[PDB]
């Protein structure tokens, strides 16, 4: 599923992401836009052999199991394929664990490079929320 911007905002809000660990909803929309282009099926292989999955590009080195990242962890205790679902529940639950991990949203390189220190509320303007 490729979400619309306000559609994803609404879904993220309902799942508890607005102000989660102090990150306003626009942060999470901005992250999803630049990580996955709002596409729940997005996958990208990393140089270390791990792969990023889903709308928030969650990495198999730590967070999910994809059966091909030797020595990795599975901290969200889920198959990486669960992160590709049209339903974002599994991505949001795992994102909450990631953002709690110590480095906040810096865990998402795209967020740090393209969202951090910008007018992120812009990502939720015009939305009925
Ligand atoms: Cl593995
Ligand atoms: Cl933080
Ligand atoms: Na893993
Ligand atoms: Ni990544």
Curated annotation (Swiss-Prot):
Report disulfide bridges, numbered on this chain. 6-127, 30-115, 64-80, 76-94
Q: How does it assemble?
A: Monomer.
GO biological processes: cell wall macromolecule catabolic process; defense response to bacterium; defense response to Gram-negative bacterium; defense response to Gram-positive bacterium; killing of cells of another organism
Its name, as the record gives it, is: Lysozyme C
Going by the entry's taxonomy, the superkingdom of the source organism is recorded as: Eukaryota
Q: Which gene encodes it?
A: LYZ
Q: Which organism is it from?
A: Gallus gallus (Chicken)
Entry binding sites for substrate: 101
Q: According to its UniProt record, which protein family does this protein belong to?
A: Belongs to the glycosyl hydrolase 22 family.
Its Gene Ontology cellular component terms are: cytoplasm; endoplasmic reticulum; extracellular space
Extra remark: Lysozyme C is capable of both hydrolysis and transglycosylation; it also shows a slight esterase activity. It acts rapidly on both peptide-substituted and unsubstituted peptidoglycan, and slowly on chitin oligosaccharides.
SMART domains linked: LYZ1
Q: Which reactions are catalysed by this chain?
A: Hydrolysis of (1->4)-beta-linkages between N-acetylmuramic acid and N-acetyl-D-glucosamine residues in a peptidoglycan and between N-acetyl-D-glucosamine residues in chitodextrins
Q: What SUPFAM superfamilies has UniProt attached to this entry?
A: Lysozyme-like
Q: Which Pfam families match?
A: Lys (PF00062)
Q: Which PROSITE patterns match?
A: GLYCOSYL_HYDROL_F22_1, GLYCOSYL_HYDROL_F22_2
Alphabetically, the GO molecular function entries are: beta-N-acetylglucosaminidase activity; identical protein binding; lysozyme activity
What are the entry keywords?
Allergen, Antimicrobial, Bacteriolytic enzyme, Disulfide bond, Glycosidase, Hydrolase, Secreted, Signal
Q: In which tissues is it expressed?
A: In the egg white and polymorphonuclear leukocytes.
Q: What does this protein do?
A: Lysozymes have primarily a bacteriolytic function; those in tissues and body fluids are associated with the monocyte-macrophage system and enhance the activity of immunoagents. Has bacteriolytic activity against M.luteus.
EC annotation from Swiss-Prot or TrEMBL: 3.2.1.17
Catalytic residues as annotated in Swiss-Prot or TrEMBL: 35, 52
């Amino acid at each position: 599923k490729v979400f619309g911007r306000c559609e994803l905002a609404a879904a993220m809000k309902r799942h508890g992401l607005d102000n989660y660990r102090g990150y306003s909803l626009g942060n999470w929309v901005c992250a999803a836009k630049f990580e996955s282009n709002f596409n729940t099926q997005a996958t990208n292989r990393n140089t270390d052999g791990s792969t990023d999955y889903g709308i928030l590009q969650i990495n198999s080195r730590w967070w999910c199991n994809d059966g091909r990242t030797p020595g990795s962890r599975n901290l969200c205790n889920i198959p990486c394929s669960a992160l590709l679902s049209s339903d974002i529940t599994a991505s949001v639950n795992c994102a909450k664990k990631i953002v709690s991990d110590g480095n906040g949203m810096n865990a998402w390189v795209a967020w740090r490079n393209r969202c951090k220190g910008t007018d992120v509320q812009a990502w939720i303007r015009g939305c009925r929320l």
